[model samples]
Target: FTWRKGSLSKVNTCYVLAGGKSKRFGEDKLLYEIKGKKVIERVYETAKSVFKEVYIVAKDREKFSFLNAPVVLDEFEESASIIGLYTALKHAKEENVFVLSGDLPLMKKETVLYVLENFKEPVSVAKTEKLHTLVGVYSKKLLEKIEERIKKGDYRIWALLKDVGYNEVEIPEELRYTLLNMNTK
Candidate 1:
């Protein structure tokens, strides 16, 4: 699938944010086994199927040594999803990126395709009542804004959405369950 705007074509990059502290889970949830495969593996495999290139964004580069794709260490010390987003944008070789949390083992390729097919704005995200910040497509154009937010200690994902003109595609009832993140044991 392709997202085009006149002559400027969108190069899609899939990023899995795997650096969460997992305070509530009491363990590294990404390494937890589900159906024989690790949670991070499942999410990475799903993302690999949808995008040509996939990356795992983590705090420690050595932790995700099993993943074949590049593992990017967070550039900043802050432990927030926004920092992960910033790191993804900084290292992304593409114009567009679809960022997903490593805990989302059930993320489906079909759902990802649906999001990309309908993406029209600079930022396109799926929403039920709350925005799924990690499971959205972001434009490289927002890099400057993201950097500004990070420097100012504003790490809320909602703030990024508000800063950019975005399209919130409502998640259909049938596909809602796939968005469940495996945050706990």
Candidate 2:
């Protein structure tokens, strides 16, 4: 599925993966409030502004009950971002799904739109020195490929990129701050 610029409003579904164990932070990072707003709330608001449909993927649905959007439980037992991506693909209503980490409290709507605007391949991701695998746009066409990888125990997202070609949108120096993920206080 090819995405045209300015078609992001209706063509994409944003999935916020909020089920991480937050071992580094030593607590539920999403619930961590920053400036009076929960981290997940900020991410959800950003996603809500850019996409018509938005959902949160979590291990326990009850944990995210306060969020207005639907909270989908991870279908796979293995705790990894790959499983979250798989669950997003399985439940996405649109062919293009924007998968983002819930810990990204500073994620901007423009950054999300920038990735969508430049999406021309099966996978289009934002990259600096490191690949932001979780913050990317994926086509539902790769659902089968992702499932195959999970069964083989290859859960690394970078490995999936190797199997399928992807387009990288280099993060400009000015907008680099938006990629900051709040793993710890």
Candidate 3:
């Protein structure tokens, strides 16, 4: 496929965070198949359709060996959403990276396209009734802020958002299903 320099803009890379311990779900929800395709695979395919490069950011690379995209490990010892964002930002080829959780099996290409097109802040996440903090874009500019928070023991995505601020892209009502996190059986 030919590179669309005009359309690609600043964010070309995307990372799907799959490192969460699925205790509440009672299983690895990402690995669960949705009509044959695994939850993570569906998310990956949607991201691949919209972004130039797609990666699976997980704690263990071995678990995602079947995927064609690169499986990246978190840089920090702690397991948190902020670390996943940090890892994605560090490894991204571009100045900005779009990050999403891997459990959204029903995620669509249009939602990704919409988010990528309007990502204009250090952090840009979809805000339905609740904020989809893990499903959005992150600027490399937030790296210092994240490190400082990590050092200070504030790894929550909520705190990071409060520090760096974000553009809350209101999810279209009809397309809200894309943000449905597959959390349980």
Candidate 4:
């Protein structure tokens, strides 16, 4: 698929989510190296190609300092990615923000551009594996929608999406598998 470049001036801030506890990986998964580069570095590099400003969302400053971008810690660990997204939305300069997972080292620049190019409203998602929704674009314009969900203890991104308008790009079978590969084993 051809990935037409979107204007960085339209949505300048991109937040990479690295706030997970990584209980499954038994360590900070973002710190894991993929071909000599940290997984977070891979994701950060991908995001940097498209967005004007790419930042990492983490709970600690020292741990994720290896990356080039600034680190913004989440205020509530209880909410995880959902809370992290909200935190980024609150702090980001642009009304629209693209959120990518740090562990998705296999994600291609084409896939990232695909989401950005196709974004319409306050939210957009790439549908690959069973409605994969984490690697998505969100807008601060949906702040009211997000706040309403948070008020009701509905912190899931999907739950919040229920109240906002979003576009979904269904990835093909081949690209779907590639995007779903979260790590190199």
* Candidate 3 Cα outliers beyond 4 Å, as residue runs: 1-8, 25-37, 183-185
Tens digits of per-residue lDDT, candidate 3, 60-99, equal: 7776787777888875656788888888887877778889
lDDT of 4 by residue, 1-185 (tens): 12223444376668988774554554555445333246678888888877777898888777777786798878675746678777788887877788887777578777877676677776788887566567777888777777778878887877777768667878766667646544445
CA lDDT, every model vs. true structure? 0.76, 0.79, 0.78, 0.73
Better-scoring candidate (lDDT), 2 or 4: 2
TM-score of each: 0.84, 0.86, 0.87, 0.82
Model 3 lDDT, residue 103, Cα:
75
How does residue 182 of candidate 2 score in lDDT? 55
**Residue clash pairs of candidate 2:** none
Using TM-score, rank the candidates from best to worst: 3, 2, 1, 4
- Which order, best to worst by lDDT? 2, 3, 1, 4
Ten residues in sequence with the least summed lDDT for candidate 1? 2-11
Best TM-score among the predictions, by candidate number: 3
Q: What is the lDDT of residue 137 in candidate 3?
A: 85
Which residue pairs in candidate 1 collide?
A: none
Which ranges of candidate 2 are over 4 A from the true structure? 1-10, 25-37, 183-185
lDDT of 4: 0.73
* Candidate 4: stretches off by over 4 Å: 1-9, 25-37, 183-185
Candidate 1 lDDT by residue in tens digits, 54-171: 8999887776787776988885666898999998989877778888888775778767777877776688887866678888888888999999987897888788789877888788
Steric collisions counted per model: 0, 0, 0, 0
Candidate 2 residues 1-185, lDDT tens each? 12342353445578999874544443554455443237778889888887767899988877677787798879666689889999998988778788888877678888887777777769988987788888888889999999999999999889998898888988878777898865444
